[PDB]
Structure formats: C-alpha cells, structure tokens
Amino acid sequence: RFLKVKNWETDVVLTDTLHLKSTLETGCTEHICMGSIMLPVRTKDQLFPLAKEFLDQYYSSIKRFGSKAHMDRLEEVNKEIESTSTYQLKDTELIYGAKHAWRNASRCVGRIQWSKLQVFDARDCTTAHGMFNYICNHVKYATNKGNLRSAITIFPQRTDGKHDFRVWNSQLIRYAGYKQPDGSTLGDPANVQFTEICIQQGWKAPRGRFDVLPLLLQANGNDPELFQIPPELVLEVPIRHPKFDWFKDLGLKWYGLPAVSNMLLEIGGLEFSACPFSGWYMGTEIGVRDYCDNSRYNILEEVAKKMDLDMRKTSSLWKDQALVEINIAVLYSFQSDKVTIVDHHSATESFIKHMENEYRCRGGCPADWVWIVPPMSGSITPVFHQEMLNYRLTPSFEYQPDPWNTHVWK
Amino acid sequence: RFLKVKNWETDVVLTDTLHLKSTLETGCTEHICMGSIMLPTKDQLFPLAKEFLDQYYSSIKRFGSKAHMDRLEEVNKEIESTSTYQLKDTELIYGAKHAWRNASRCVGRIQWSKLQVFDARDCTTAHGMFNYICNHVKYATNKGNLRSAITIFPQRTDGKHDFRVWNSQLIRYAGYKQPDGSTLGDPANVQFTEICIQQGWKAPRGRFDVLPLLLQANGNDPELFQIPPELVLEVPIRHPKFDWFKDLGLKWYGLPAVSNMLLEIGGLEFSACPFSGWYMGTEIGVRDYCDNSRYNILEEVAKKMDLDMRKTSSLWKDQALVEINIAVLYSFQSDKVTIVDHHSATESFIKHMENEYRCRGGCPADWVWIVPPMSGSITPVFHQEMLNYRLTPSFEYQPDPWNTHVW
Numbered sequence: 001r002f003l004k005v006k007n008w009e010t011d012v013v014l015t016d017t018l019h020l021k022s023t024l025e026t027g028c029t030e031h032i033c034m035g036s037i038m039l040p041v042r043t044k045d046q047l048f049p050l051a052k053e054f055l056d057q058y059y060s061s062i063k064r065f066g067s068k069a070h071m072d073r074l075e076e077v078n079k080e081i082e083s084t085s086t087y088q089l090k091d092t093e094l095i096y097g098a099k100h101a102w103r104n105a106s107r108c109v110g111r112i113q114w115s116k117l118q119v120f121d122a123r124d125c126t127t128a129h130g131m132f133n134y135i136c137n138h139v140k141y142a143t144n145k146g147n148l149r150s151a152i153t154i155f156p157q158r159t160d161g162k163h164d165f166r167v168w169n170s171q172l173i174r175y176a177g178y179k180q181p182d183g184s185t186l187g188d189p190a191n192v193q194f195t196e197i198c199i200q201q202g203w204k205a206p207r208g209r210f211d212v213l214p215l216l217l218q219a220n221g222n223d224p225e226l227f228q229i230p231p232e233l234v235l236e237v238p239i240r241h242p243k244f245d246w247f248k249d250l251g252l253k254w255y256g257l258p259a260v261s262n263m264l265l266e267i268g269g270l271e272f273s274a275c276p277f278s279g280w281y282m283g284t285e286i287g288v289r290d291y292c293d294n295s296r297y298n299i300l301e302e303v304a305k306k307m308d309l310d311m312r313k314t315s316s317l318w319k320d321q322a323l324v325e326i327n328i329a330v331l332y333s334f335q336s337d338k339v340t341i342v343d344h345h346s347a348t349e350s351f352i353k354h355m356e357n358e359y360r361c362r363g364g365c366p367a368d369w370v371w372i373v374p375p376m377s378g379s380i381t382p383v384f385h386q387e388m389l390n391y392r393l394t395p396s397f398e399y400q401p402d403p404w405n406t407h408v409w410k
Numbered sequence: 411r412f413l414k415v416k417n418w419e420t421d422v423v424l425t426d427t428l429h430l431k432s433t434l435e436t437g438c439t440e441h442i443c444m445g446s447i448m449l450p451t452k453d454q455l456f457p458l459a460k461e462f463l464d465q466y467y468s469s470i471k472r473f474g475s476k477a478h479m480d481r482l483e484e485v486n487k488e489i490e491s492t493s494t495y496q497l498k499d500t501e502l503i504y505g506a507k508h509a510w511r512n513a514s515r516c517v518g519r520i521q522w523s524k525l526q527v528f529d530a531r532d533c534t535t536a537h538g539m540f541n542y543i544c545n546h547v548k549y550a551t552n553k554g555n556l557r558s559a560i561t562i563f564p565q566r567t568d569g570k571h572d573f574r575v576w577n578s579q580l581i582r583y584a585g586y587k588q589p590d591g592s593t594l595g596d597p598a599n600v601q602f603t604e605i606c607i608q609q610g611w612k613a614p615r616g617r618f619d620v621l622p623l624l625l626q627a628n629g630n631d632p633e634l635f636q637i638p639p640e641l642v643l644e645v646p647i648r649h650p651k652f653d654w655f656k657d658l659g660l661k662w663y664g665l666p667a668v669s670n671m672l673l674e675i676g677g678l679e680f681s682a683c684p685f686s687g688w689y690m691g692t693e694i695g696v697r698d699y700c701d702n703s704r705y706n707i708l709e710e711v712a713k714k715m716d717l718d719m720r721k722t723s724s725l726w727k728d729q730a731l732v733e734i735n736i737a738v739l740y741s742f743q744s745d746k747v748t749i750v751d752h753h754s755a756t757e758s759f760i761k762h763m764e765n766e767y768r769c770r771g772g773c774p775a776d777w778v779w780i781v782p783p784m785s786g787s788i789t790p791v792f793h794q795e796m797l798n799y800r801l802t803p804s805f806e807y808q809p810d811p812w813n814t815h816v817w
C-alpha cells in the first residue's frame with residue numbers, strides 16, 4: 001500500500017511505504033484518532049523473531065543481507081537465545097540500533113542529526129558509582145565547552161526484570177522543584193516529586209530557584225544511589241535580552257545540555273532501560289515551555305509587567321508579545337555564550353529537509369505533527385503546513401514507568 | 411472501551427464514551443495515525459434515518475414514545491415509497507445545530523445551540539438563492555454584532571439536481587495571476603476568481619475585491635450576483651501604535667461564512683448549506699495575512715518595523731506576527747465588529763469540552779485544528795488531550811462543483 005502526505009504550503013506531495021514495516025500499535029483505530037494523547041521480561045518465543053527482524057535490518061543496512069556473516073550471526077543469536085534466553089549485541093549493532101531509535105523517534109524534530117550520534121557502550125557497568133562515572137564522562141563529552149555533541153550512554157540491558165539499570169532522573173540535568181507549605185513552588189514545578197525522592201535519599205537541597213539536581217542511579221536492580229555531578233561539568237547560561245537591560249535582572253538561567261534519561265531503548269527485542277541521550281536545545285523548549293508553561297516557571301506575567309504591556313485584556317496579545325521577547329532572550333544568551341542552540345525556524349526548516357530526504361532514501365519518516373510543530377508561531381514554521389504520518393518503527397525509544405513506581409526496595 | 415483524556419496543565423482527566431457511538435471512519439488504523447492529514451439506496455437510508463430520529467426523540471425526552479414510533483414508521487413508509495424523505499422543521503434545526511456540535515475542527519462550538527437556521531428548502535432558482543444569501547449575510551452581520559446562522563437549501567435527490575454555492579465562503583477576496591508571475595489579491599482564490607471571469611464577472615483587478623456569488627440551483631449552471639456592497643461589512647486594519655500600519659492598505663471582511671461544505675442529517679444530504687459565526691483573530695492575522703501562500707505580508711511589516719531580518723534567530727517573523735495580529739483585533743474591535751482572540755476562544759472551548767463531557771459523554775475534537783496557529787502552548791487547548799472521531803449529523807467536505815458540474 002502507498003500513502004500520500006501533502007504540504008499545503010508548497011503542494012509538494014510525498015509517498016510513504018515505510019509504514020508497511022510498522023509493527024507496533026498506535027493507539028488509534030478506524031473509529032478514533034488518539035493522535036493528541038501523550039501516552040496511549042520477554043520469552044525466548046517472541047525474542048528471536050524480534051532479533052531476526054533487527055539483524056536483517058542491520059545486515060541490510062551494511063549491504064551484507066544474506067551473507068555468511070549475516071547467516072552465522074542469526075544462528076549465533078538463535079543458539080544464544082535458546083542457550084541463555086537472551087543475547088548480546090555486537091558493538092556495531094548497538095551503535096546502529098541506537099542511531100536508528102533516534103532516527104525513528106517520531107516526536108523528535110532534530111532528527112536531521114541522527115547519523116551523528118556518539119554512542120558510549122556502558123554495558124560492562126555493574127554499579128551505581130560506575131554509572132556515575134559513565135554519566136560524568138557523557139556530560140563532559142557532550143557539553144564540549146559549549147560546542148554540544150550528540151551522545152548516548154547505554155547501560156546493561158534488562159535480563160529478568162529484577163536487575164534493571166535505571167537513571168531515576170528524567171533528564172541528567174534539571175533544576176530541583178520545591179513545594180512550599182503556602183502552596184507556591186520554588187524552582188521547577190515539574191521536578192517536585194523527583195526532588196522529594198532525592199531529599200529522602202539523603203540529598204541536601206540548597207532550596208534555590210535553579211539548583212542542579214543530583215543523579216539518582218540504579219544499577220543491577222539494586223536500590224538507587226545519589227551522586228552530585230561535578231559543577232564544573234554543568235554548563236549554564238545566564239539569560240539576558242539584547243535590548244531589555246532589565247531582563248537579566250529576572251535572575252533567569254538554564255543548563256545548556258538537554259539529556260533525556262528516563263526512556264527505554266529497544267533494539268532487536270532487547271530492552272535497555274538506562275540509556276541517557278543528549279543533543280542540544282531548540283530555543284522554544286526553554287523560552288516557551290520551561291519558562292512560559294503555566295505549570296513550569298511561568299514567567300509570562302513578570303516579563304509582561306516589566307515591558308509595561310496592557311495586561312487588562314488578552315486581546316492586546318501581551319502574552320504573545322512577552323513570549324517572543326523571552327524567546328529572543330534565550331537564543332541571544334546562548335549564542336552570546338557560544339553554547340549550541342537552534343531556533344524553531346531553523347530547526348523546523350531543517351526537519352522538513354530531513355523529512356523529504358528520508359522519504360526518498362528510506363520511503364518515509366514517521367512524524368508526530370502534534371510534537372513536531374513548535375509551541376509558538378506554529379503556522380509561520382513550515383512543519384505546520386506539512387502532513388505527517390505517525391507510526392512506530394523499531395529500534396525505538398519508548399516511555400517506561402517511573403522507577404519509583406515499580407522498584408522493589410532492598 | 412471507555413477512553414480517557416487528560417489535560418497536562420491541570421491534570422484533569424475526562425472519560426469519553428460518546429466515541430462509542432461513532433459510525434464513520436477516521437482514516438487512522440492501529441498501525442498508522444493520519445491525524446495531521448487534512449482530508450483523509452433506500453436500504454442505506456432508513457438505518458441512517460432511524461439512527462437520527464432515535465437520537466432526536468432521545469433529545470426531546472420522547473424516546474420509545476408513540477410519537478417516536480409513528481414518525482419512525484412514517485419516514486420508513488416515505489422512504490420505501492419515495493426513496494427519500496423530508497425532515498420536519500424541528501428535525502432540520504436539531505440536525506443543523508448538531509452538525510455544528512459535532513464539528514471536531516471547530517473551536518467555537520460552545521456557541522453551537524444558538525444557531526439561527528434559515529430553511530431555504532422551498533428555494534428553486536439561483537436568484538432565489540441570492541435572495542436567501544443576502545438575507546443571511548444581512549442577518550448574520552447585524553451591523554457588526556455578528557449572529558451565527560446557516561441557510562439550508564434543498565437536499566440532494568438524484569445527484570443531478572444538487573444546489574451548490576461555488577464560493578468557498580460567501581465573502582472572499584479575488585486573486586489574479588499577474589504578468590510579473592506574482593499574485594494580486596488572495597492567492598487562495600485565484601482559480602475561483604477565474605471561473606467567475608470565465609463566467610462573465612468583471613474583475614476590478616484589485617488587492618481586495620469582494621468576489622461575486624456563483625449560485626447553482628437544481629443542478630442548473632451557476633449564476634453570478636454581486637452582494638450588495640452595503641451588506642458586506644469590512645474592517646480597515648490599523649495598529650494601535652504604528653501609525654504607518656494603515657499605509658499597508660490592509661483590510662478584511664467581518665463575516666466568515668463557509669459555503670462549500672455538505673450538511674448530513676439522518677442520511678439526507680444538503681449540498682448547499684452556507685453558515686457563518688464570527689472570526690477568531692488568528693484566522694486573519696496569522697493565516698490569511700501571514701501564510702506564505704496567502705497575503706504573505708510578514709516581510710513588508712518586518713521592514714516597516716525596522717528589525718534585523720538577517721538572522722531567523724532574532725525572531726523578527728515572530729515579533730512582526732504578534733503586531734499584525736494585535737492590529738487585526740484592534741481594527742475589528744475599534745469598528746465594533748465581533749471578533750475573538752485565540753486566548754479567549756480556546757478558553758471557551760476548554761469550558762465547552764468539559765460541558766460536553768459531563769453532559770454528552772464527550773466531545774470529538776481535532777487537536778491539530780483546535781490549537782491556534784500562533785502561541786500554541788500558551789493557550790489551554792495545547793495541553794488538552796483530545797479524541798477525534800466522526801458523529802452525525804455532520805459537516806463534510808465535498809468536491810468543488812466545477813470538477814463535477816456537467817454544463
């Protein structure tokens with residue numbers, strides 16, 4: 001079957017065949033679309049077919065499909081699975097798998113960079129301290145003094161589901177959130193629950209507005225352990241505005257390294273529950289969502305007041321005006337400190353080019369419109385006008401339950 | 411099953427069961443989501459009529475009554491004998507309001523029950539249609555205090571006597587292809603504008619020329635009509651701070667009136683059912699004015715604001731976008747012409763959703779269309795999970811007439 005997607009701004013129509021290799025479900029049915037829904041131990045039996053699918057894809061990618069190497073590898077894995085119930089990926093397969101999980105992430109607008117991913121193999125890791133060391137090396141490498149480099153660190157895969165490696169942080173670097181008895185929130189409201197877990201685990205919180213959270217690391221299914229990332233390794237950017245000298249006085253800053261660490265990387269049926277990865281920020285992630293979401297830093301008012309906008313009626317679009325300036329500030333500050341960042345215009349334009357390229361070289365590019373379109377100025381970015389097809393391909397990055405909800409404490 | 415939708419800004423979770431009554435396909439499957447795709451017999455008729463009448467009598471607290479059974483049999487006998495049937499005025503009104511109620515892409519549905527329905531089912535000619543339309547335009551415009559309305563022309567029969575309004579909206583500006591290769595006026599209407607010329611219209615070759623109505627009655631060829639200029643309310647766009655804004659020579663019409671959709675009620679199809687409400691600011695300021703394929707005025711506005719357009723990261727496009735939208739709203743409010751900003755409209759929809767969930771078990775909504783084209787996440791709907799599904803009565807898209815009309 002063939003599926004056409006059209007860009008209503010350019011009339012460019014693309015054809016998708018890649019979706020044919022989509023196995024996982026989407027949540028939608030022929031009677032209902034769940035396209036805006038945030039989130040709608042294996043047996044030897046269902047493992048080899050998953051392994052075979054992957055290895056076939058891998059060997060096909062290196063132009064060795066059907067080769068003796070390919071056939072031996074399949075037999076090797078088959079025997080290993082029957083012999084040990086699981087199997088180990090070769091380093092090459094790991095790197096290939098990691099890159100493709102990114103390539104397949106339909107909610108990621110930065111995928112034009114997928115082939116350039118530095119993969120750190122941390123499968124020989126056995127303890128939390130070991131994980132800490134690996135993560136520090138990842139942060140230092142990825143940060144590269146402001147010239148950010150995409151990277152992923154992969155810890156040991158799941159075995160029986162009772163020895164999982166997990167990074168309890170949702171992101172390697174995030175600011176603590178603190179619920180005050182008066183009901184107000186200090187810091188990032190999104191991290192209050194995790195911050196409480198850290199404190200409970202022994203973390204001495206400086207209770208500030210921008211305290212870098214400590215890493216809570218779980219190795220081999222053991223209870224997690226706290227570690228403080230060396231401050232000298234955490235790059236941060238003070239936010240100021242090019243024209244508004246008072247903006248800096250808002251006391252705002254943000255870390256330069258976005259590093260998701262709570263997702264599960266699935267490769268050939270294998271599950272890597274601890275696989276922190278990082279690239280670099282798109283301006284709006286911070287300027288629109290982290291700063292202006294009502295449930296996050298929510299700085300729209302204070303910024304609007306300082307700009308002395310007419311906040312008596314929404315129709316003055318004061319929120320919209322303040323929103324722009326704030327995002328101008330974020331981009332300006334990062335560029336000024338020479339810390340990698342990309343604006344939503346550049347990033348979405350790049351994604352369209354990436355997408356078109358993917359349709360031609362791969363027959364498609366699963367994309368989640370709801371997530372791809374920036375949270376501000378939607379229609380003035382090309383992606384808004386681009387029809388997209390969302391489906392799931394493996395390898396992939398999947399959500400997994402928060403560890404504190406499933407962990408058996410020792 | 412019983413699906414739930416969560417709002418990630420307020421954690422509020424709502425359960426949807428209304429979807430369990432959906433009958434039409436969405437275009438999606440268990441393997442692929444087409445949520446961002448813009449356009450994914452007597453035997454067939456009675457079940458549809460039955461479905462409708464059942465919900466109708468259910469809505470009037472007379473489900474399973476003799477009146478219900480009687481009507482059901484009457485329509486039944488009517489279909490068997492006439493291969494179709496006629497809706498009672500009451501059923502017509504109910505159906506029209508519900509088609510709106512079910513429009514998953516409309517953010518202004520909190521207004522659904524206040525629709526004024528004009529029964530034009532006795533219409534027979536294009537002049538008759540013009541008369542009905544003029545009356546609709548004047549009624550809905552209400553000197554600037556817009557009132558929602560829909561005018562329903564005769565239902566489909568054998569498909570060869572279909573009533574159709576060729577315009578996409580009762581009021582739109584013409585578009586002409588110039589030698590320069592550029593486009594004069596609204597690029598979106600270039601084709602229709604030519605079909606008017608190709609039909610007789612004398613285009614003034616302007617930037618904002620109110621197109622003429624092309625009405626089709628009983629399948630006959632369509633006829634042109636100039637909407638009494640005095641009936642077409644327009645708003646000059648000026649900025650509440652940039653005195654130079656007026657120099658752009660921009661203006662827009664106050665009445666948004668979709669006229670190319672098909673109203674489906676109890677299996678019956680009304681191919682000519684122009685309807686109107688009022689504008690949400692972004693429709694004009696963001697889409698009509700800033701879309702690259704539309705009046706695409708960002709650069710011009712940017713230049714006059716004298717901001718660095720060298721780098722995209724200066725966010726000049728964004729800065730200018732806001733000003734253009736502040737101007738649109740300002741101009742409409744200044745001239746006392748109804749209009750709603752995206753913040754207010756989205757706030758209303760969230761409220762509407764909640765009402766619909768507790769009063770009807772849900773609300774089909776298309777997130778992709780509901781979220782405004784600018785400042786998405788600072789509006790509540792961005793954080794609102796929505797379930798999209800099709801319910802009837804409904805407003806459906808239909809082929810442009812000039813691609814099906816046999817002159």
Ligand code: HEM
Pocket residue numbers: 098102105107108109110111113117150151152260277278279280281282285342347397
């Ligand atoms: C090169 C820089 C990159 C940029 C500019 C970029 C940008 C983005 C943005 C703007 C989002 C949306 C975030 C949100 O709204 O929460 C996102 C999501 C995502 N990206 Fe990328 N990304 C980049 C690198 C990466 C890397 C290195 C990976 C993996 C190897 C990746 C995997 C994903 C995934 C899985 C999601 C969805 C996460 C979720 O569902 O919460 N991205 N990316």
Ligand code: HEM
Pocket residue numbers: 510513515516517518519521525558559560668685686687688689690693750755805
């Ligand atoms: C009272 C004021 C109303 C407001 C503020 C409102 C607002 C909107 C907006 C912003 C859109 C999207 C427009 C676009 O992007 O093209 C829309 C679409 C739509 N509205 Fe409403 N609406 C109103 C009244 C009506 C009425 C009276 C009806 C029907 C009786 C209606 C039926 C629909 C339908 C079917 C669509 C989708 C049209 C399409 O697919 O192109 N609306 N509305």
Ligand SMILES: C[C@H](O)[C@H](O)[C@H]1CNc2nc(N)[nH]c(=O)c2N1
Pocket residue numbers: 036037038370371372418792793794795796
């Ligand atoms: C309910 C809705 O799915 C939700 O708010 C989504 C919308 N689009 C998004 N897009 C991105 N990039 N990130 C998000 O967190 C979201 N949230």
Ligand SMILES: C[C@H](O)[C@H](O)[C@H]1CNc2nc(N)[nH]c(=O)c2N1
Pocket residue numbers: 006008384385386387388446447448778779780
């Ligand atoms: C491709 C994508 O579906 C398309 O650009 C949609 C997105 N959302 C929209 N939303 C509204 N209200 N109106 C539109 O015309 C669109 N266009």
Ligand SMILES: N=C(NCCC[C@H](N)CNCCN)N[N+](=O)[O-]
Pocket residue numbers: 110258259260277278279280281282285286
């Ligand atoms: N740019 C990236 N973005 C994703 C992580 C940062 C997101 N703004 C935080 N999302 C929090 C979960 N709702 N990732 N990256 O690796 O570069």
Ligand SMILES: N=C(NCCC[C@H](N)CNCCN)N[N+](=O)[O-]
Pocket residue numbers: 579666667668685686687688689690693694
């Ligand atoms: N507000 C309304 N909007 C819909 C019609 C006007 C839209 N801006 C035109 N969209 C063209 C279809 N792609 N309708 N209304 O009845 O109020």
Ligand SMILES: [Zn+2]
Pocket residue numbers: 028032033034035438439442443444445
């Ligand atoms: Zn879907």
